[model samples]
Target: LPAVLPPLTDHAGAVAHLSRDPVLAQVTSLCGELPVLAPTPDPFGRLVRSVAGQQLSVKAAQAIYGRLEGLPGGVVPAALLKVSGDDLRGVGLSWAKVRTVQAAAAAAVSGQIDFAHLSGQPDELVIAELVQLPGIGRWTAEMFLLFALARPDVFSSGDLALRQGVERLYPGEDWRDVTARWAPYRSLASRYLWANSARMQAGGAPL
Candidate 1:
């Protein structure tokens, strides 16, 4: 079962909660002045956006997703996948992603995959369900679980920025050791780390 997330309410509250840890404290100190990181509300919508964003820059992904949302059924229903492959391709989707979206839409519409049921399901089960389709993997499912479902405790160790952020905060620690300390609150830690990375990039102070 997924744990309910306390509403973060504001960036400072989240930072204060995370600052108890030395590594997170360093991260916040280095990048604390950056803006808060918040997850989007709709899990399914996030999944769709994730699909569009995969391996692409944020600008590229946004343009494609914008086009997708303008399509019929607004990117959630299976029927949108029925659009010609050429049409989908025209919107910046590769053939592989087109197939993946189609499979996801079919599963969603056929009652085989009920996103509503996911909130109550275990994260492992949710991952299993999502990965059963083509083009979905552990990282993708994890991202969906975090941003899409608004689930509170997911961290994508596979992400390079997260790994690098941990390294920056704790110079001598190995990846496995560094990630272990964040434990129950790793997802929140991830939010801070991601925000911290962005802040550092923009030459801002850590929160």
Candidate 2:
């Protein structure tokens, strides 16, 4: 696959497989190739950041995430658990988001969710466990896999803009069908799709 390219260590290496698909190749053409997005090992911090970043742009998410980290307890489970939901909301968290963050922190304290070993867990297994927590859904789980665990094969069927990008770029082909072909490298394809989102949203996606 991909002229026997190097191993898939990161987004840069993982995209090799997508280059083989004609449709995805074109998608990458519309938006220049994307660099690999490495994942972090801080499962708890990542999940907390994910809650704050919901339905937000990267720039917007980064802003809220910064405020959360600055909380007195320093973004740890014990700190978040000790703080009232309203306190979190004061730092730009929506009520629902505050509750979700609180839930994760509660779980962490109760030993219901051990984020330390979360990366070693299978993608679906991690999703199943995390979804059992409040406010964490398939989208959040999938995002965790892609961004936190750095699983190369993961893709978010629940991602709206990804779905939107799919509909706009490929046309005719079902999103699921097109995404299935990018397997083991779908995350790389996702980055490429995201690169074209603005163009696609503005109705300027190169046809």
Candidate 3:
């Protein structure tokens, strides 16, 4: 696919180009390195992990995923199918999240969704297919595009931090339109936005 690039592909040019924008330049100054865009080795597991992360804080998601990954059969598609919904719930997932994870595993094992083939598919096509699963919304689909497939241009206006980060940086600016300026490298821009947002939340100096 597309010349077979490595994980966390070189993005020095992306950083340079995004730095052209004043807001992004400030964010880049505060948030040093371009965030890593490494695709997970297991697409299905990553999808389930994203589900686990939905509406949850980073620390909460990490804790739940740690338990899920340590399940008897691990987080593999077939392995997930083997676990009960109660078992998944015991790992700190809500009933809805439990159902979503099970649905994804079912899709994968039943050939309804092919995790291996998703990497080569078009962005919108992958998003369209993934949302067909229960509780899998556009936000989760966008996360898959960015974190699972490592697609460079994807952005999620649906993300809470991206919205807040943009507003915090450019007060009164229409974030929707402002995001367009970061095209073809919005993924990198998003990473900086989130990074800066995290810093701001931690009482760090404003960007």
Candidate 4:
């Protein structure tokens, strides 16, 4: 069985490993510690939320998901199908996202792309399965694997924020090459990379 709380027992050891890497030591230090992947990760609706948030701005996505609560059938598939196209479109979701949401909901209801069997599924297998949803992509699938499934080694190399953060922090090294060293804990590193991006964008002090 997959550990609800993975083998982060040597969590500090992982931190120490990053701390020794010349490129990210200060980056990690400045950003503070990476939190452990949550035990008993939220499975259902997390994938739904990820799909809904795909291209839109964060504020827009939240507002739309909020609408899901008041929606007649709630955030489930049967309910989503019951939602009229005009209503879904009016909810600030692009037609593409609404369609995608419907497809995912169908899969959820059918147990084809389901929450129940996810723990036993392999990391890449989870990605392959979820990508079956119409609007989902490799990027969204990778985020699901890293966060919902709590696969620490999973990395979203295509994430623009991560790239900008790595580029800004290590102007001299290749982001891909350097970040691979964070392997088995790259997801932890990703959290800090995002934070570091925010600090950099805000024009804070540089190392």
Candidate 2 wrong stretches, greater than 4 Å? 1-13, 55-60, 201-205
Off by over 4 Å in 3: 1-8, 53-63, 70-72, 90-92, 171-174
Screening candidate 3 with a backbone cut-off below 3 angstroms (N, C-alpha, C), the clashing residue pairs are none
**Estimated TM-score for each candidate:** 0.79, 0.82, 0.83, 0.82
What lDDT would each prediction earn against the true structure? 0.74, 0.77, 0.83, 0.74
Q: Compared to the true structure, candidate 1 yields what TM-score?
A: 0.79
Order of candidate numbers by TM-score, starting with the best: 3, 2, 4, 1
lDDT of 3 by residue, 1-207 (tens): 233333447778788888889888878888888656677778888887888988889999898999999998898899989998888899889999988899899999999889987666777877888999999889989888887878877679899888877777788988867888887788889888888877888898975
- Write model 1 residue lDDT over 14-130, tens digit each, in one string: 566667777688776765464334645556666778897888998999999999988877877565756777888888899888888777878888877886566567777888888
Give residue 194's lDDT in candidate 4 (0 to 100): 82
Weakest ten-residue segment in model 1 by summed lDDT: 1-10
Candidates 2 and 3 compared: the better one by lDDT is 3
lDDT by residue (1-207, candidate 4, tens digit) is: 233324363467777777777656787777776567652454656776777676768997787788876799777767777888789888777888878888887787887886766776767777787788888888888887777667777668789888877777778888778888897678778877887777777897877
Q: Residue 107 deviation, candidate 2, in Å?
A: 1.5
Q: Cα RMSDs of all predictions?
A: 3.2, 4.3, 3.2, 3.2
